[model samples]
Target chain A: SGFRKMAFPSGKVEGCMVQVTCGTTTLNGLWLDDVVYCPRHVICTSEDMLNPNYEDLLIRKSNHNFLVQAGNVQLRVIGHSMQNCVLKLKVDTANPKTPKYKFVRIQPGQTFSVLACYNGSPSGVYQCAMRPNFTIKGSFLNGSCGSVGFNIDYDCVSFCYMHHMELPTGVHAGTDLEGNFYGPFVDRQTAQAAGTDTTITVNVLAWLYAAVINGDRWFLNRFTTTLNDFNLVAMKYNYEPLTQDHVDILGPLSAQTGIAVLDMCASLKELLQNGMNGRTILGSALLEDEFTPFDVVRQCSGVTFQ
Target chain B: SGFRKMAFPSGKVEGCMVQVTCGTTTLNGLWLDDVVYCPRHVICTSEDMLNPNYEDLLIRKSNHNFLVQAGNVQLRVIGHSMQNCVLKLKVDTANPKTPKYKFVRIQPGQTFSVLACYNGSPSGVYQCAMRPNFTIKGSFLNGSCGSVGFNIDYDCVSFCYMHHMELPTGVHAGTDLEGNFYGPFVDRQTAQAAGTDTTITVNVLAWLYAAVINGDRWFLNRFTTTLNDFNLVAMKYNYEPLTQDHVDILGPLSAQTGIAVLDMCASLKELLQNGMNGRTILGSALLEDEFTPFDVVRQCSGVTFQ
Candidate 1:
């Protein structure tokens, strides 16, 4: 397990190059090149977010290096092998006070000039074991590797029986040093009421793109996500004075808007219909034969509820 | 791509053995043993399902072999390699009819007694290529693999922006020579009203275990899910009359009664509420600001919906 980082000031006035060396087993494996997590999901707002958000996913550790628009990108080893990974980013500016962060979906090998350089040779790979579940199953589509080694035959059906997703809609619920909830929605509505709710829309496109590829199992599963919740992503919509925005869109009043909880339980809806503290209502709103959760008033609509 | 099968009859079945030879690059890779789609997800209803379901998953081709209850298990080459692969399943009896199908997680290599034998020597592995998407993103949980090569550092954030899922809830919608739709719901509602539904409950457990392992990427996607929608699995709930159940659980009155469609579209609900022809109701009710579909009356609860 080798986790390292490089933060350097913006100087050089030029670009850079990154070279990776690893064991290549097959033709397919050769192109797979390498595996690394690209930096894309940062809640890039005007003022740094209180509860920081840094969502990431597994990208092909490709031979074709790349770069991104914003956010501090990271690098790592994928295959359980050892190799030489040399990285050097040549910046276009100089005399900057301190190092900043960034990497866009770098193109065919052009890396972000921010991470100055990262050079190392990892030699060990450990296995995190897993026991496939028997409850859920699946069918195979494209054939080549699993369903028949090399052909997509509808005649031949294939399946996989493993664990499925079992999670609650609520997330990032612990606390900060000040006892604040690290959340999609913190509990503070006083700011908006005072007309000083400084909120910005998250870069939705740039942030959520990774989850799709990682698929539903992204629960950080395969390797102990110790691997993916990658599918049912937990995004942060607001911060302190945790207020929900109303009529959110690419317009002026966007900050005044918030997300509407899509699904609802009849009994749960009944609870939200009344302006009650989300905490207290949940204590007794444990209505059977209803939805798993009914805590949207405070997290979603906020004061926008009619 | 090496995909081979074995089918033998029964008699004096004394069960056989399977031998696999490959290269181990690391300790983790060693335990990984091999990768095989375990035969778990078959819609095990009485008298073979018209729309067959063989959903499998990537199981730890481990040192400890296991066995399952029903269905014909299969074996194949997982990693791209050339080896002296061997498998033999001896039967207890001697004089049976023809060869059958089987591998119930043959413990520590104690394979089934059906796939008489499969011996091969493969030598090449091909790569399927992919470009990480720039739309949706993900967050890391595990310590080693991607996020931080080896540790989970919350303070230092990471993310990957990639493509996402794009599929229709409708599935197996093509045909079988006579051009019949392979389906979760084949359009044969006439059989139920005639009292010949003959529908059976799919062994929910045995059929859906694989999707969890493969994750949403099971769309054979990575390799061509061609990889996974594994999350939103399109399971077959009924056959023929293609009727829905009334109250599903571990009880009787199940076949006659069908599943009630959950998460309905408001507009679609209105259409079904009228008891109009499902085919016709949908023609004029393409209501916007509603749900992705209102096609439940015909798929779920069937005539049972009050």
Candidate 2:
């Protein structure tokens, strides 16, 4: 029930500071001034160095400071105790009217980043809250102090589990809202489609992105929806006149205009077909059927059915 | 192979002038200006109306001038072919840099709508293939349409079955790049630690969300992950170092941390000592003895300790 825990480091930098010391007769014993050193090395290391997306993976964070981004750029938080801390990211839109403070929860030892497409109108200061799930399944990602400790590791496991499960299509890197890697295949369609339909697109990204990250456990579903039908029928048998546009899309004048219903059906069929194929279809493949011997069927018997 | 099918309507409209005639008196024959006469008294009906969210449900793509918010929106397409259709909706988002689009596939005679907190994105300008896991499931709250005919009540049986199953929690909603939800969660943690070590907080929103949506089916799940310990160990070994800032949030020390190992033995002990009473170490309400009675109770209570 108990695990070893450590607090912040000491305020002294004697052991941490780099010192140049040598020994010899008439040799030099030099002290390097204004030099900071790590217990291992002064130079911090991160693997995704070449990619601009993860340059800030080692950036430090303190309670007093939060790096503010001037432009529309993807922001990543880096620091020590960032793992297992609930993060409540609040974004202030450029338009002051609409609901601005949008929040996204982060997992412990996980990294949270937004696409923050440049020049997007509703962009400004974004804040976050670090919290735990209903159960202690995972922690939130947040600010950190100096170095990573055992506690960070503790949260890392939980965060990793959450995000890894969330982004199966992409290679996820980092801990809770800390550092993460998305896959190479970012859909170009999502890269564009701006104007009017932005919110729908954004939410689609959030949901579908989660689906991709989460993997197969999610239902790949689709549907055909009829609105006001129940109410219409309830209101009595009075058919509203079909509009001119409705006729164009579904009427004979339009070619394959009203295909949403067909599309929904085809999709459902595919989903069922794939589900079935996943099990029985494989079982039926290349089987040795004693009732129908294929050994003598090497040649195609030419037969025509009238 | 065919089952009962239900018909549903899906449509959208905006910025239009419509004249709706309601009463039978007006229906008989009404004239305007000083032109013609009315049928026994005068009943006039003419108004410009903006189709509200619900009202838009009645307007179909039958019209070519139906002004819809320019962007991708989910709408039920009906019939065999998708042709000329017009739908109106809001931009959802003004900006387009971070575009999000999802094209869900469906079967012939089924209906779907946006169910949970997901499906809130805009439509894409061009037709795009949907992501893998959510290729087709659920419905669209912000409905739109194109040539394909779609309504929300095509496959009633299948939709009900999956809805009842709460596939979102069990599997359907979780699929990502790796074919499962667990990977993204895990990878996210490792990458965060390796990169910036951004402080984060974890929450059980995922679990709670699933529970709220699924109900009883959720009980089939346990507070456990199927991924083995070995996989976690490998991830830890492969992960890069943590950032200084990460160390700070994790603790005061600056270092990359490892994973937290769960102790199964302790968990089992807690399971057995669930209920004892006021002075009891465990609560009696949680665990029951064989003498408690009932076959179902016995089945639940009498299980292998493991």
- lDDT for each candidate structure: 0.17, 0.18
> Highest TM-score, which number?
2
Per-model tally of clashing residue pairs: 126, 213
True interface contacts reproduced by each model, as a fraction? Answer: 0.00, 0.00
Clashes of 1: 126
lDDT (Cα, 0-100) at A27 in candidate 2: 9
lDDT (Cα, tens digit) per residue for candidate 2, span A237-295: 22122223322322221122223323322322343335323222111111111111110
Model 2 CA lDDT for position B274: 42
Candidate 2: segments with Cα more than 4 A from true spot: A1-170, A173-275, A278-306, B1-143, B146-306
Tens digits of per-residue lDDT, candidate 1, A246-295, equal: 11221221222221211111112232233222222111211111110111
